[PDB]
Amino acid sequence: PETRPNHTIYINNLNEKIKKDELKKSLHAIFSRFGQILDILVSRSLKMRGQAFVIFKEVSSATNALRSMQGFPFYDKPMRIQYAKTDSDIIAKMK
Template structure:
């Protein structure tokens, strides 16, 4: 099935010998002629090697870029470009739909907890209230089960909608985890309540909990 037009394009068949920052700068410079760019995601993990995502401000810019740059030789390899399947966090924040998306995720998570018949003990364990009662309150939350292509910008777009965000820290060599710091323990608890179980993509449901002190 064809992927519908999107502000984000997915590029593959890139030269995987090029350093990540050089590739990001090159892609930004090459594609900025088609319009405003919100983000360029290019990682060197095994799963994402030779691939990148470019997030434009609107679909028109992305469409022009796709048509004009399809098979364009970059670093001696013709690029293969298509629309990305998922809407990026940068796009959702730009068009004002990120809060709605988060609310839908929270509603779906709550509905699942109410109807899937899981034992009460397991449900209690997943709630911030139970975590706090176990004495693990912290201003820092620990995020796990993140996609390999996760970037700091993606997490900032996601957690930046919540009050009290101080810092997002990635772990070198471990793109599947991150730490997010808030001003107060209460704000960190709200972040857990809002985003624990958030469906990042089709394969990854993010886990958010208080970090161990």
């Protein structure tokens, strides 16, 4: 499904075989064009693998990145994007 707009986009269906550091970098490579990125959170734990949170400084960036990159073939798999259900700490830690 999905939710309300947010500064952060929740990505899943990501190739689980890629290491944390490389995954982070390839994501900046792919998403930096949509706007400034505050951070990318990735974990390879049993619950969080195959998922990533890309935190943009501006919601419009997240909105554009979500429309443009939906299903983008990344590491041989169709990337799935939704707005994150809750604000990330970096974002709340500001406003």
